[PDB]
Amino acid sequence: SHMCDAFVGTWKLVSSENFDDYMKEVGVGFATRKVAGMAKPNMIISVNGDVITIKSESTFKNTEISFILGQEFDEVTADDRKVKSTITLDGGVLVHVQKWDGKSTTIKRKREDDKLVVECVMKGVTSTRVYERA
Ligand X SMILES: C[C@H]1[C@H]2C[C@@H]([C@@H]1C(=O)O)[C@@H]1C(c3ccc(Cl)cc3)=NO[C@H]21
Give the residue ranges of the annotated binding site for a fatty acid. Answer: 129-131
Q: Does 23 engage in binding with ligand X (CB under 6 A)? A: yes
DSSP character at residue 7: G
Q: Does 56 engage in binding with ligand X (CB under 6 A)? A: yes
As measured in angstroms, the least distance from the Cβ of 18 to ligand X is 11
Q: How deeply is 61 buried, as exposed, middle or buried, from its count of CB atoms within 10 A (0-12, 13-18, 19+)?
A: middle
How many helices and strands in the chain, by DSSP H and E? 2, 10
As measured in angstroms, the least distance from the Cβ of 47 to ligand X is 17
d(CA 32, CA 20) in angstroms, rounded, equals: 10
State which residue, 1 or 19, has the beta carbon closest to ligand X: 19
Give the largest Cα separation in the chain, rounded: 43
Which among 14, 31, 33 has a CA at the least distance from the CA of 122?
A: 33
Binding mask 75-114 for ligand X (x = CB under 6 A): --xxx---------------------------x-------
State which residue, 32 or 104, has the beta carbon closest to ligand X: 32
- Site residues (CB under 6 A) for ligand X? 13, 23, 28, 32, 36, 41, 43, 56, 77-79, 107, 118, 120, 129
